[PDB]
Structure formats: C-alpha cells, structure tokens
C-alpha cells in the first residue's frame, strides 16, 4: 500500500497472509474452512497465515494453516486478468476470535464513490522498493465506469472494478495483491491488478466479488 496507514494490530482480523517460505500475496478468510484470493496468486505449496500483524516476528495470535486445495476461476484468462479469483481451503478449520474473523460475501454490487477499505504488507512506495512488516491500510472509493475505461481502454471488463485517487499517491501496490477490498460491511473487491502504484490517472484495479458470490457458494458448498 502507497500512501495508506498503519492498519494497527488485529484491526483487520479477515486479512490473511499467503506464504510459500515468503510472503507473496494477501486474502481474505470468509468462513472458518475457505480463503478467497487472486487468481494469479496461485501457486503450489501455501501456507495460510491468519491472524498477523508483523509477518517477520510470531507474536502470539497467529494462525498457521496449509491449504489442503485451490479452485482457480473456470474462466480466468492469465492474458487480461479477467475473471482473477481463486478459493483456497485449508487443511484443518481455523478457531475465529477476536483477532481471526470472517468477512461478509456481498448481497449487492456497490455504487461508485462508495468508501471502501484495501489493506495489505505491499510496497509503499510509487518509486522503488519498500516493504513494511506490519500490515497497511487505505481508505479508497470506488470510482466510476467511465473513469475506471478511460484509463484503461480497451481492458475492462464487467468483472472488474477501479477504486483510489485520480490525483495519484494512494494505491494498492506490489505484494498487495489478492487482497481484500471491503466497502458497507462487505467483501467487494480484490486487489487484481493496475499500471504502476499511486500514478497518477492509473488508479488500482480489483475483481468484482459480486459478480462470483453463486460461484462461490455452489464451489465451497461442494469441496
Ligand atoms: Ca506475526
């Protein structure tokens, strides 16, 4: 995250860190047994780490569980990045408390110039590398259509949402990926992709988890 704040500790307790000996991705825990994340996260060999804080020193409240599958998207083009989710269920159900809870699927698609909230252990600067070990936060509305296709032409699609500041400066970045995006309560994004971090006229662009709430349930209900 560019230009966000110190979340604080367990103040964001859906967030979940994918490791494979490293941090590579973020997620999003939405029931005791299922992970959402990106597509374009996967990889063989996670592990899913609930419950941090500072992902560099083990700090009591933590979490560590393998993941025992992951369902890509049936639809996911690697190409365009349309249809970037994936489900990730772990080998054994995690104890939800105070700092490990689930996050809502969404009943409805939010409207533009909703506040959302995008967090992650990304990069924090927009030039050059910078990575914090506690988690970042960012307070972002979702921006309109054609603002979100201006910028992008030819490479939106109705799975896909842009969300952040057309000034630049406050972004999603680098290692924030298959992150969450929660607006009014609910999961309604996923950090998917974007031209660069906080550049101006680029804002961050996410998977539009309203779209796949059928998918998902039908998914988990059946693995
Ligand atoms: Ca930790």
């Known amino acids: 995250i560019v230009g966000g704040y110190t979340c604080g500790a367990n103040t964001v307790p859906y967030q979940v860190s994918l490791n494979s000996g490293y941090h590579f991705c973020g997620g999003s825990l939405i029931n005791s047994q299922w992970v959402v994340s ?13 419950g941090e804080d500072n992902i560099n020193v083990v700090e009591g409240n933590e979490q560590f569980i393998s993941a025992s599958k992951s369902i890509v998207h049936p639809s996911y083009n690697s190409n365009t990045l349309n249809n970037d989710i994936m489900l990730i269920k772990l080998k054994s159900a995690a104890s939800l408390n105070s700092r490990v809870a689930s996050i809502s699927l969404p009943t409805s698609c939010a409207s533009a110039g909703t506040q959302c909230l995008i967090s992650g252990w990304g990069n924090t600067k927009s030039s050059g590398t910078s990575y914090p070990d506690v988690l970042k936060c960012l307070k972002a509305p979702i921006l309109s259509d054609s603002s979100c296709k201006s910028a992008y032409p030819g490479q939106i699609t109705s799975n896909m949402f842009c969300a952040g500041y057309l ?30 971090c906080a550049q101006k ?23």
């Open 38 to 50: 990106a597509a374009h996260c996967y990889k063989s060999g996670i592990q899913v780490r609930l």
């Open 167 to 196: 000034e630049g400066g406050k972004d999603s970045c680098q290692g924030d990926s298959g992150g969450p995006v929660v607006c009014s309560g609910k999961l309604q994004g996923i950090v998917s992709w974007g031209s660069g």
């Open 201 to 223: 006229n680029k804002p961050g662009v996410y998977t539009k988890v309203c779209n796949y709430v059928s998918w998902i349930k039908q998914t988990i209900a059946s693995n």
